[PDB]
Design a protein around this nucleic acid. Sequence first.
DNA 1: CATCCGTGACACCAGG
Lengths: 48, 94, 49, 97, 157, 227, 227
Amino acid sequence: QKRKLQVGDKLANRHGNKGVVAKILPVEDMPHLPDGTPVDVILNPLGV
Amino acid sequence: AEPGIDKLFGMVDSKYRLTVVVAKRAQQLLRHGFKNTVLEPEERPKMQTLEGLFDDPNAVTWAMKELLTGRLVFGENLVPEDRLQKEMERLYPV
Amino acid sequence: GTALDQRPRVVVGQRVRKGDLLADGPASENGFLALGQNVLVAIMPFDGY
Amino acid sequence: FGKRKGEGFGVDKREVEVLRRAEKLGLVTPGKTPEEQLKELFLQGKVVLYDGRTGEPIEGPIVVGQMFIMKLYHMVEDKMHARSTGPYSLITQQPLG
Amino acid sequence: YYITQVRKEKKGAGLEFATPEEALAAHERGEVALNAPIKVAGRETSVGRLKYVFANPDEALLAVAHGIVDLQDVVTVRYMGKRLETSPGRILFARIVAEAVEDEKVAWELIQLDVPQEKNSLKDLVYQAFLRLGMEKTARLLDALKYYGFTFSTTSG
Amino acid sequence: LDSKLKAPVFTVRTQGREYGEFVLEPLERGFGVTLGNPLRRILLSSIPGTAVTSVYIEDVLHEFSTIPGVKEDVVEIILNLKELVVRFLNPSLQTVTLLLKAEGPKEVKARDFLPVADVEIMNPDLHIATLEEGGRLNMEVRVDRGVGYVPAEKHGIKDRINAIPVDAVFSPVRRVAFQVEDTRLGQRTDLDKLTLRIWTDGSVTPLEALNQAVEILREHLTYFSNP
Amino acid sequence: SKLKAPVFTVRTQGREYGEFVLEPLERGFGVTLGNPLRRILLSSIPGTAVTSVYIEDVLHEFSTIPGVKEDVVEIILNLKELVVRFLNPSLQTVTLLLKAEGPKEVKARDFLPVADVEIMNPDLHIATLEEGGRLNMEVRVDRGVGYVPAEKHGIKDRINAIPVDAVFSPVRRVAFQVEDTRLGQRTDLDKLTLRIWTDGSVTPLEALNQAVEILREHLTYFSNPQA
DNA sequence: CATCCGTGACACCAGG
Ligand SMILES: [Mg+2]
Ligand SMILES: [Mg+2]
Ligand SMILES: [Mg+2]
């Protein structure tokens, strides 16, 4: 089976920041740079 | 929150008596096909289906709204149990 | 249950020296350990999500 | 940014508002040009960011950058489970685990 | 917290003025900040409390919408019939509570307006709302606080 | 892959000429906010209304002065004038000056303004000021047509030397709240449901305001036609 | 004092890139117009994408082909980037046929041509065949809108066909700038510039027109109220 | 009235 990322799958970085994917927004809802490039992931600052 | 939960807690001397009353009333409604309801047709709880609004099938929502009307009497030693059973079977057949 | 597959990283006619990469294994990008993705993150709250 | 300055676009109005907010925050020096203050923010790792739902900017500059993120082995596809009724144990006649 | 905090600026730095039009003109020259504490004729105030005087919450928040002032600027607003020196954000928070509990007088009695909202003050708000209005209204208050806290934290920067 | 989209039912829920809820469901994923935000901006910035823009009160020099014989200061009077809901019956009229002269023991209301042709004061019961024995109030207020919100120190219009400029609260709309909730149509899962909430002052109604908003937006969409 | 219809400028670069300017617009209407158009451009612009692939002697996606360097997963990932423009408006499905052998880097050109069908990225790599490696593919391109994963459409024309994830949208990027501009004595006016990058299937101008039409059609939905 | 000794007890869910 080819498993895509879905709501409830667990991501983490190398510094101990772990978290479960709670929401997959469509591209047009994502915060984007002034030149129109949307961001991929939105991490909460309260985790730091 | 259950609509009017503060009032329901005001109606009883113990929060668990409210639960006993509501559950017994819900079983009474389930056994008699709701035919003994004290709610007028406009007070009936409704459920939105694909076609249109229908009667809420949740006997507990019904029992709590009935309690909220004031049209119900609750207490200990009101009537012998089988007397109540047979009178409700007469007034509302199954 | 994770897939362990190797993929060829060379092409026909290529000159290779001793110790040069020929096939990337699982979680390997051109011989570097590839355990994830490089994503573009913004660090901000988002409506409680 | 020099790319944009060459493609024929100046600094945006929302960028000006975010720069005003950043000046209030003590993040950029008051008096410099928009490009200078945007460069100061960028050196702090922060950029102007637009809310995709409204087009208005995030009131402050936001940290944005590339991060290495992995997908761990704990996927909900393997863990979601439910049961109405099912097999029971020999001696205890209780549900299996 | 972000919407209920007030700005404190250093430009004016406590200048003394006789007439408020002097302070307005000084701020217009660029010599005094909008939220810098000053003293006009003897009483401590700021330029923002004089330049902007709103007849009601709706006007203050309309001006906030049009970019005239920010939620963290100390301004003068007429709410509940009193002439309040407070930010539009604190007015907005008072209105959030009032709409949530559907009781304007009690909601005004519960809130501490002149303080930024944080863990302890919001906890005291939830407890007092409980005592005074019941768990159904307190649950609606909680969901309102959730909605607006998330909303304002998103765009706060 | 193949899609079918039922046209969404538009639902109105009003309470007088002051408030209304507007529900538009179902909408394809995302169009809730795509429709709500521009309409909100337009309803708050470009719906035509009226506003007090300048006030002259006899023997009053500046805005922060007190008035002998009246209990309120000039600031309070200017606030009450900001709350004046004036309606222009004639589409050609653009500006009026309203006269008000009273004295003695009396509480001036918005009724006491001398009537002017095709100027309907929607809220005549609006309190303005109270005077005492020996209190005199001679004032003229300036009412202009406009949109949005303009601070007093941005138009600064002065008919005479002591005409105090007033922050022009043009917009007939006082608040626009909107909220999108997820909704389903059968097994379509992420459809949107739009809910508008519009407060006005009575001069224009919420439904009228929303229709003017959608009209402005469509007319702006027409601007992509002639290179 | 009502501002009137603004000048609309169009700059283009091939079928790929486009800048669209509107000026002057009232304050805040730069965002009011630009953002919903951007959302609709990114979400609701119809287009084309590969939706199914059959390969001879290939039973499923997790396969290799002798003589072919790329596995089937990489071949489908490559085919996911195939831009296919339809010239006929009423065309819905095209079955591209590819047949190759020998030592060659099979690119997108090698697809046998079909009438009223153009491949916009012909240099797109497909496979790296060696001596004796044969590749015989039948790919299927459909018209569609938005993003539809293989698990939702499951399009198979023959038994051993592999459904493919389809990114139907032809819009690769949308930005918009709002700059300060003036008309006469009016200041704080908006100058809106939509920058649109597409794939070539549809041009930036066609996408802008379709998005404008979609937004106007959605504004139509407020026409029939209901208590 | 002490020391010595034998016998108890030592978090939950999950998968194992
Ligand atoms: Mg003022
Ligand atoms: Mg209080
Ligand atoms: Mg949705």
